[PDB]
Amino acid sequence: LSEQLKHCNGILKELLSKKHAAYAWPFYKPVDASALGLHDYHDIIKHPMDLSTVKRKMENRDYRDAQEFAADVRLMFSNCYKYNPPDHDVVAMARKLQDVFEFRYAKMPD
Ligand SMILES: COc1cc(C(=O)NC2CCN(C)CC2)ccc1Nc1ncc2c(n1)N(C1CCCC1)CC(F)(F)C(=O)N2C
Ligand SMILES: [Cl-]
What we know:
Layout: H1 3-15, H2 21-24, H3 33-36, H4 41-44, H5 51-59, H6 66-83, H7 89-105
Helix pairs in contact: 1-7, 6-7
This protein binds the ligand COc1cc(C(=O)NC2CCN(C)CC2)ccc1Nc1ncc2c(n1)N(C1CCCC1)CC(F)(F)C(=O)N2C and chloride ion (CL).
Residues 26-27, 31, 36, 38, 41, 80, 83-84, 90 line the site of ligand 79C.
């Protein structure tokens, strides 16, 4: 990994760590819309994204730069803001995890 992608990998590891598990856990795995009863999920959300997919793409060297990584993480949050009422608990959890992400992403070496 490049220096910037090392920083992204560190962010990823942090977002998956026990320190943030109380609000990060809905984002660990792909939304299983059928299991959750969300039968309109894939009509509303065109591009699903989750942290296990980000992790697989990092491991496979899919991301060519930090911007591509950031776009996927932010896409995950945007899907949550699109599908759920703004006052829902899961949106509150998204906001808190995105705060962790954005403040550490801003510390990118450059
Ligand atoms: C097994 O996992 C869960 C279990 C329970 C669970 O067990 N809920 C209760 C069931 C009955 N008892 C056990 C109390 C908890 C609830 C949610 C789960 N998982 C999940 N992952 C991701 C999302 C999500 N949920 N969101 C929630 C909001 C409300 C309806 C799903 C909707 C969403 F659109 F998919 C979304 O954006 N995200 C980010
Ligand atoms: Cl972006």
